[PDB]
Amino acid sequence: ASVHGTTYELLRRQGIDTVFGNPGSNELPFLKDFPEDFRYILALQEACVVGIADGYAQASRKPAFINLHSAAGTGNAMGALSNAWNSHSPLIVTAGQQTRAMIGVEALLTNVDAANLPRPLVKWSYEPASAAEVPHAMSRAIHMASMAPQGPVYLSVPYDDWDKDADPQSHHLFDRHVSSSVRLNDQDLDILVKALNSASNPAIVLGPDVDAANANADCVMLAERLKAPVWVAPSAPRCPFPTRHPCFRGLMPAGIAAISQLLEGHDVVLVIGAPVFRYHQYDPGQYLKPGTRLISVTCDPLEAARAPMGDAIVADIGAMASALANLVEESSRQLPTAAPEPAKVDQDAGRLHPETVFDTLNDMAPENAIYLNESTSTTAQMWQRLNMRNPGSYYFCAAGGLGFALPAAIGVQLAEPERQVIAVIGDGSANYSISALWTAAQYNIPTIFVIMNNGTYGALRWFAGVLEAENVPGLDVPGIDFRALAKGYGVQALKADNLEQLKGSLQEALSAKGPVLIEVSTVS
Amino acid sequence: ASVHGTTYELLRRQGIDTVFGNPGSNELPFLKDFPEDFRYILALQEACVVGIADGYAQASRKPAFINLHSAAGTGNAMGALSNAWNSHSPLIVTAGQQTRAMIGVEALLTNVDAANLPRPLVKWSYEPASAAEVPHAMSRAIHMASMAPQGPVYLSVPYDDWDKDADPQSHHLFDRHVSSSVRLNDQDLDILVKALNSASNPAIVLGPDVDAANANADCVMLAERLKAPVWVAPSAPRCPFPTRHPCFRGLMPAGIAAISQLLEGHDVVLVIGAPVFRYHQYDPGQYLKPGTRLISVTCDPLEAARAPMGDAIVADIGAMASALANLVEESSRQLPTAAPEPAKVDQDAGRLHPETVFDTLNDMAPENAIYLNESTSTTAQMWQRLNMRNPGSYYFCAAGGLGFALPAAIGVQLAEPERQVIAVIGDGSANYSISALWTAAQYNIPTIFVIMNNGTYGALRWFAGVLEAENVPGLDVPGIDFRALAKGYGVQALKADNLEQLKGSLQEALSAKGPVLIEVSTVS
Amino acid sequence: ASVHGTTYELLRRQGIDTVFGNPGSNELPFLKDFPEDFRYILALQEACVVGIADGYAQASRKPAFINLHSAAGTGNAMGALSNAWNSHSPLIVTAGQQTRAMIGVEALLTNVDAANLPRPLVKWSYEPASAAEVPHAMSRAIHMASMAPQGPVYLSVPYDDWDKDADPQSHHLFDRHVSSSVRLNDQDLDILVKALNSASNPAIVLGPDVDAANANADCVMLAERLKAPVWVAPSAPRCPFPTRHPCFRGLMPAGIAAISQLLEGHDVVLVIGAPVFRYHQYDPGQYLKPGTRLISVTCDPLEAARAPMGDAIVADIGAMASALANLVEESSRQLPTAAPEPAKVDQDAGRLHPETVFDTLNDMAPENAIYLNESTSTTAQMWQRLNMRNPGSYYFCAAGGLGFALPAAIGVQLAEPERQVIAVIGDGSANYSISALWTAAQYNIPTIFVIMNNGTYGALRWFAGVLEAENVPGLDVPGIDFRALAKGYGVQALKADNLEQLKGSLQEALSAKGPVLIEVSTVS
Ligand SMILES: Cc1ncc(C[n+]2csc(CCOP(=O)(O)OP(=O)(O)O)c2C)c(N)n1
Ligand SMILES: Cc1ncc(C[n+]2csc(CCOP(=O)(O)OP(=O)(O)O)c2C)c(N)n1
Ligand SMILES: Cc1ncc(C[n+]2csc(CCOP(=O)(O)OP(=O)(O)O)c2C)c(N)n1
Ligand SMILES: [Ca+2]
Ligand SMILES: [Ca+2]
Ligand SMILES: [Ca+2]
Ligand SMILES: [Ca+2]
Ligand SMILES: [Ca+2]
Ligand SMILES: [Mg+2]
Ligand SMILES: [Mg+2]
Ligand SMILES: [Mg+2]
Ligand SMILES: [Mg+2]
Ligand SMILES: [Mg+2]
Ligand SMILES: [Mg+2]
Known part of the structure; x- marks a missing residue:
């Protein structure tokens, strides 16, 4: 042949x-x-x-x-x-x-x-x-x-x-x-299990390889057995845990000092399916304060080798999470209390606060919606305000490279026709891969694209603050008409210039048969 | 500091x-x-x-x-x-x-x-x-x-x-x-000059490094002295010679057989500032037929090493072209006769033939216009139908990578504010770097973008013929509204659905103060 | 075929x-x-x-x-x-x-x-x-x-x-x-020649590409016309100049400060065929003192780009040296005074000082001998004490990698059967490529190998001084019998434990028909 x-x-x-x-x-x-x-x-x-x-x-x-x-x-x-x-x-x-x-x-x-x-x-x-x-x-x-x-x-x-x-x-x-579906040998696994059972104040940190392995439910079981708070590792490309589960403590800030502060007081920290750690911003301090042992389970030798602290086990996340969840004892410690509900931000009849957009999405989207994030200044609020109960519900550019979410949202929607995909993308980020819109139109892939338009590269203004950088060129992107870009590639184009329009446009988009782009005027 | x-x-x-x-x-x-x-x-x-x-x-x-x-x-x-x-x-x-x-x-x-x-x-x-x-x-x-x-x-x-x-x-x-402004030593240069002076039927082939060096005028002098026909080397990224000069014989097709047939009968072929040769399509035959000696002057050792035939000299194109033009004898042979004017193709009141578009551009554009080409099925007609008298008048993606001409036309226009830039870009090619339009709008760089819209990747249909490739997916790009894309990025958008509209839209674009995009309906 | x-x-x-x-x-x-x-x-x-x-x-x-x-x-x-x-x-x-x-x-x-x-x-x-x-x-x-x-x-x-x-x-x-036999265009060459003619106190530095190009004689003429002192650039892989010519000032030490001190007071320094510069040891200071302009002629773009000072011209060393030698004016300044003869060091009837070995070689070897050097602690003395009048007379590992001289001496002898090759190699260096001796025996290539045996990696003891490094392991190499190694590979083996034995063994080796190894007992 x-x-x-x-x-x-x-x-x-x-x-x-x-x-x-x-x-x-x-x-x-x-x-x-x-x-x-x-x-x-x-x-x-x-x-x-x-x-x-x-x-x-x-x-x-x-x-x-x-x-x-x-x-x-x-x-x-x-x-x-x-x-x-x-x-x-x-x-x-x-x-x-x-x-x-x-x-x-x-x-x-x-x-x-x-x-x-x-x-x-x-x-x-x-x-x-x-x-x-x-x-x-x-x-x-x-x-x-x-x-x-x-x-x-x-x-x-x-x-x-x-x-x-x-x-x-x-x-x-x-x-x-x-097959790479392997886990730690019995003798050493039994030792690890005893270390987890013996911990008085364990914590768990989860990364994207948990969600890739569909190990989310096993991690829920493990967290419940250990009665342990659970964080998602910084710069999170995926969501590995139900975000309104009582154990959940949210996204870790991508800073050395911020993370060692969160982990202080926890005698054993178990990291599963994450690099240790994907820091980002300048935020100097201690990697790990005294009194804490860190143990990492990773599928990637490169991650294990480069961690600046802790023991590591290189194994399949699915197999390890399942084994640990089924072997650890049920602790009699008090189960954690859920994080408080986010406060409502007041919204006048003008431009939308990002908090309003996320609260409205959470109110209206199906409970098995899949979100993609490339709205770089609003990530913390997104994690706080979207209840993501299911696996496979969140994607963010894993190397920080813009131009991921718009096309990836189309691929996700193609893979998951039964789940509504909603990509929340900043006005700056939308341009990198704008032509991907055409593929959604041509193949009638019903992704919803929510463009957060505030006219600027907002996250870069934040980094300019951290890095004490003034008189920097190139931070503003005025004069882009996203409804016209959408029309250019054959995608239905709606606007949301206030809250009433946001509610209407989302209601419509969720009832549409093809892809829809909503241009949201957000605060600067 | x-x-x-x-x-x-x-x-x-x-x-x-x-x-x-x-x-x-x-x-x-x-x-x-x-x-x-x-x-x-x-x-x-x-x-x-x-x-x-x-x-x-x-x-x-x-x-x-x-x-x-x-x-x-x-x-x-x-x-x-x-x-x-x-x-x-x-x-x-x-x-x-x-x-x-x-x-x-x-x-x-x-x-x-x-x-x-x-x-x-x-x-x-x-x-x-x-x-x-x-x-x-x-x-x-x-x-x-x-x-x-x-x-x-x-x-x-x-x-x-x-x-x-x-x-x-x-x-x-x-x-x-x-400095790398170097040329062949006097003894060996004199040997080369004598070989040119005694050739009975010399030919010259010029590549993009001639235009990069602004050696064009020296090459005109050299061709006039030797009474030699001049071709541009295949897959031409630049134009190195006035295209209506009597010596000019056009763009060489990017085929092994095609080129050896053109050079047959010429005892000495002098190649200046080109690879030998940037072939493209499948077109098997001889590299060089008997009776022809080839001498290549190149600025690039890598080009000299990989040529399948001929002698080579690695030197600065400007310095070599100037030396040769001033040292060779004036041949008493008859000057080559200019190539015939292209035929006017039949054009009805509907969609535009590309030949009509180029004839109209040539009639209306200023003599010092700069053209960029990313209309991949129409290159041969473009070279035949545009009179480009000056250096720096033509650019085409040098590695064949689409997404060059649209942004590059903006950079060329920024560099040459006194010369009107006109980018002729296919509907397929326009998408690769579509967001570049925004930079022309924001900085008010007055490039004219002529989008040749025939709904398909036409050159790939041609290659499918040569390669005998049927049932190929992905060759059609229906449903792109280029006027809407231009509006999306703040660039004025005009249409040309027939010849009268083409004439009008070009007259307007040539009188504009900012960038203009013209969407031309061309024949499939 | x-x-x-x-x-x-x-x-x-x-x-x-x-x-x-x-x-x-x-x-x-x-x-x-x-x-x-x-x-x-x-x-x-x-x-x-x-x-x-x-x-x-x-x-x-x-x-x-x-x-x-x-x-x-x-x-x-x-x-x-x-x-x-x-x-x-x-x-x-x-x-x-x-x-x-x-x-x-x-x-x-x-x-x-x-x-x-x-x-x-x-x-x-x-x-x-x-x-x-x-x-x-x-x-x-x-x-x-x-x-x-x-x-x-x-x-x-x-x-x-x-x-x-x-x-x-x-x-x-x-x-x-x-051909890469190119030189600077006439206009810019004339500018360079005028700068050389106008210099009040020029200096010339030559590197290995002069000897590779056989540009040595042209550099002698250039130095004579400009009445300029001549150094060999540091870490010299070849000898580009007659070492007892009155202009010759010797090998530059491979240190930043040392070289800027040597060049002080020279208003123009012309470097030909060398990197600028191949420093080695730690010796921080000014690259060039004020009042000195440096101009480098190099055949290698990588050299021109990385020089931390000076103008550069990328061209063929042979073509440029010949052009400059023939175009510069004869200066009215006095020719430099020849360097004095090296002093004779005290030598008893015991182990040999390296200075004694080089003086003896210089007294006995033919005027067209070719030397190779891998006696790392004695390079300065070798350059001072060997009169090398002709091109192609010296080789030293160009990247400092030991194991070069022993095999390279065999290849040089194969290339130059009419010139006696004499490789002067330390006891440490001899081991890296010891098996090359067999090739000399098998093909009867009559290289003379002079092994300088002092039982230690002596140059590393010198570097330990500069770097203030004490209690360093691995610096001594006792217990190697080089006459046995030579017998192992079929090469005649002589000894020189004192000056009379050195004289006899050299007289014999110079009269031999095949390769000869002489093990010299040198001071530690
Ligand atoms: C390919 C690529 N180019 C540039 C950057 C730098 N990038 C960091 S965030 C950002 C601004 C994105 O702006 P927008 O999408 O509008 O979101 P905002 O920050 O305004 O919420 C930029 C340009 C990047 N990460 N990736
Ligand atoms: C980056 C890149 N992707 C794909 C190709 C293959 N490419 C060869 S020509 C062509 C079709 C271009 O179509 P269009 O611009 O509409 O011009 P036409 O061929 O219709 O004249 C394609 C896709 C390429 N050369 N470069
Ligand atoms: C391949 C390689 N390994 C190690 C070195 C480091 N090297 C610098 S000189 C030297 C000592 C050589 O000793 P020897 O040949 O006996 O000469 P001496 O220094 O005693 O004159 C060493 C090992 C090197 N340059 N190259
Ligand atoms: Ca086991
Ligand atoms: Ca923004
Ligand atoms: Ca097309
Ligand atoms: Ca010249
Ligand atoms: Ca030694
Ligand atoms: Mg609307
Ligand atoms: Mg010359
Ligand atoms: Mg690479
Ligand atoms: Mg390698
Ligand atoms: Mg013998
Ligand atoms: Mg003996």
Whole structure:
């Protein structure tokens, strides 16, 4: 069989039925005779292609397959790959290369030294040495993306390879299964369990790999047994815990001093599925104050190695959370009391406070809504004001790279047609991947986009305060008409200039059959 | 003095007065106290930032300075860097890094293994080992970008470096001059001149480094003296010769067979400032037929090494073109006859043929117009139908990466306020860097954008023919309203649905004070 | 024709007739049917292979061809490649790779991600995508190594490629010539010449690229015309000037302060063919004192960019030295006074002072001897005490990596059979590449090896003084019998335990027909 036929058979046998792409000449021999059991999702720029695929992979908890055009297409996607690396997203990024005989003369569209292009943002990067072994290289890519710690991989394929005969041993690839579903050996697990049972004032911190593993419910059980407060680790890309559960204590600020203050007094701190820690802002102080032992469970050796404190165990989050939840004793300590309800902020008949927007969303959205956040100055309020009961309910750019949420919201909605996706995106952030809107229109993917328009890069004004930076250019973005941008790409466009309009526009959007963009005038 | 103060002094002393950027926290300590003799040009996404800077650099024939945000911002610009590499654009790309103390824990916005990120698309990539040596690193970056063969470079700077004391010997950097303005030694130059003088039927092929060097007029003199036909090398990123000069024979098709047939019969072919050759489509045949000797003058050792045929000389294009033009004898052969005028294609009262669009542009645009091309199915007709008499009159994505022309047209217009820039961009290509429109509106940069809307990726339909590729998904882009997109970013939007409307809209756009977008309905 | 046949034809047509190698399975399809007009030089370890080839290339002023075994062979040679990079040695390093079909499974002897292995120590590194284009890749490698600035390159070739059919257009590669023989344009050259003519107290500093270009005689004329003192730039890999010419001022110490003190009072300093500057030890101070302008002529853009001071011109050293020597005016100033003769140090009838050894060598060696230095604590004395009148008379590890001189002395002797090579090597340094001795015995290459045995890493004891480092382990190397090592590899072994024995052993060695090693007992 041809490399083309064999490769699509491998993909379908490994569970893949969707190609996210932006096409070019080097990809036509791969895309031709596109099989009837596959679907192609076109996006108009490669940051959008990868963002959509990323959302889809994160929500589906399965690998997503991408096809880009040579160096220029790969290059346009590299900011998106930076986020995918930090979120451990299983992305198989393929890019078409020139014919083997043209690479050395560097014909137009040659991807020069291709394997090096996406580094250091991929787990594995490769250009096969022969056409016949392309299916083997694709198998390697699929498994490298899917094994813990999951992440993006890159495969560059010369376009003349697809019509060649595949290695006739390729069929052994089709049904290979690779497991990383491992947990600490019994002897050492029993020791850890005794340490948790012996703690007088334990605390738990959860990161995004909990939600990726769907270990949320096991973490709820563990927190209830230990009667322990639970925080989400800073710079959170996902939500690993029901945010109105009595044990929940919210998002940790991404500051060294802020976090060691929160942990003080807790004799054992158990961190599960997070780096230790994804700090951000300048906030100097102690990593960990005296009297606290930290134990980290992570799926990623790189995280375990770089932690500045604590013991670590490298294992599967799902398997470890399930084991701990079922082995620890039920403590007779008092169960924590829930955090108080957020205060209502007064809202006059003018521009909307972000607190008003989140309170209104929480009042009106379905209880299984999925939120994406790229409204960078309002994250703390978002976490306080949205009740997110279910797994898979929150996404935020895991490497801080803007241009994630708008396309990712489309991919999430494609993966989860039964759950309403609502992306809350600042006016600045919306531009990075604005053309992704077209894909929602074209494929009638009913994502709701809430644009928080205050005319400025607001979070950068906050950082300017922290960093004592005055006379800084480039912080204001006046003169963008988001309803016109939405019309440009075929998406229904509503406005909300006051609270009454916000309520009406959301009511309408939640009743719509296609995607809807709401431009909200928010306070500066 | 501080690293901040010393670095701005180095930049101004080296002739830099403009920063193209999209800001973030790691860049605030660089951008604060922004000096009064500098200007900042904001763009909304980093492919746009780099495209604008690239157009500015290419048109101004001087380095452009860029400031991006860590890995995510750098990553978003990597497709743009692929084009810049191929066009030898002197781009100084700086990116802010986390504090030195935070890199090791990989805080959010740490650019991990930063120097490797932009490779292989840069000449030089570096992260300084100490704050005090940041000015030295910047000096190295400036000169690496500016020396032949010019190209992009990358410097990653931890944000805590800017407030530190600079090396007190940094002042030696300020006025360093580095020259690569070199040409072949007299003995070997005389040998080359004799070979040209005795050729019976010479031909000349010119590439983009001729236009970069402003060697165009010297090449006209050389062609007139040798009485030689002149072609532009394939996949042309720039125009190196007056396109209605009698010697001019047009753009070479980017095909191996096509080019060897054109050169057949010419005993000596002199290639100046081009790779040998930037082939593209599948078009197998001989590189060079018997009876022809090829001599290449290139500024780039990499080009010289990879040519499949001919002798090469690595030298400055300006210096070599000037020397040759002034040393060769005047041949008594007949001057080549000018190419025939293109035929006027039949045009009814409906959608526009591209030939009609180019004929109308050529009739109406000023003689010193500057064109950019990202209308990928219409390039051959564009070259035939636009009379471009002056240097610096044409730009096309040098690596074939879409998303170049829209932002680059803004940078070119900023560099050349006295020359009307007209970007001819397909409906597909327009989306890659659509947000760049905002920069033209905000800074009132009066670029004209002509969107050729035929609803499809037309060039990919053509490639599908050559590659015999049927049932290919993703080739159509219906449902984009470009007038609404322009309104979204504050750019005046006109329509042209037929020839009368095209004439009217162009007359208006040529009389406008700000940027204008014209959406032209073209034939499928 | 086969890839094998075509590749050997390319090598011979490009002037290569010698393969330096250590063989393995992946190289047998290349080495089989070895052409009768080629010679193979075997060495027993790959650092030795590369060092021998390096000496041969440097002395012959032409590229040398190397064949190593996969990753392990390449890896064993990487210290040698570090020296080759710094000396701009034109080395074509080929390494055999596994068959294409086995690279992806990573069979034993697969060179994984091969092109990245030798980086950053090579100008170009590549693994061809198709067998048919291996001759093209070899052409690229030859020209990349040979173009200014010359340096090592790497090509990894799957072993199944050699028997495949070569691209039948490969014959266009055979006679390609690339010239980098360029110099500054007339206008700017005349400006430089006027600045040199107007200088009141010029100084000249010369580096290794002068000797590589055989520009030595032109630099002598330039110095005589300008009546200027001449230094050799620090950490000198080669000798660019007659060391007893009256202008010669010796080797610059490799310290920042030391060099600015030496240059004080000189209004113009012209540096030719050197980095500015290859400092070594800690010696902080001013790079250049006020009142001194520095102008650097270098063949290497990387050197020009990183200099912390001065103007620079990137051009061919041969072409520029010849041009300047012939254009400058004869100065009316007095010629510099020759340096005084070195003093004779007291020498008893016991162990030899190094000064005694060098004085004796200078008294006895032929005037056209070629010296190599890897006696690290005695370099200053060697430069003061050896009269080297001719080009090509001195080599020292250009990156400071020990293991160079012993093998390189064999390659230099192979390249220059009419000049006696004398390598002066410390007892510590001798061990790094000791097995190279076998190649001298086997091929009867009559190098003389003078081992300076003082039982210690003496230069490191000096650095420990500068760095105030006490209680350092590993500085002594007692108990090595060099006469036994020489016998081990079949090289005649003599001793010199006092001055009379040194005189006798040198007289004998200079009359020998094969290689000779002399173990000299030197003071500690
Ligand atoms: C690709 C990329 N470029 C720039 C930044 C820096 N970024 C940090 S937040 C921010 C402002 C975002 O503004 P907006 O989306 O309007 O939200 P606000 O801060 O106003 O709530 C910027 C530009 C980034 N993180 N990623
Ligand atoms: C970044 C990037 N992605 C994809 C491609 C492949 N590309 C080749 S031409 C083309 C179609 C462009 O369509 P349009 O601009 O409408 O012009 P037309 O071909 O219709 O004239 C595409 C998508 C590319 N070259 N660069
Ligand atoms: C590969 C390598 N390893 C270690 C060193 C460090 N090196 C600097 S000089 C020196 C001592 C060499 O001793 P010897 O050759 O006996 O000469 P001496 O210093 O005694 O004159 C050492 C080990 C080096 N330069 N290169
Ligand atoms: Ca067990
Ligand atoms: Ca905002
Ligand atoms: Ca189109
Ligand atoms: Ca000249
Ligand atoms: Ca010693
Ligand atoms: Mg409305
Ligand atoms: Mg990279
Ligand atoms: Mg000359
Ligand atoms: Mg390496
Ligand atoms: Mg003997
Ligand atoms: Mg003896």
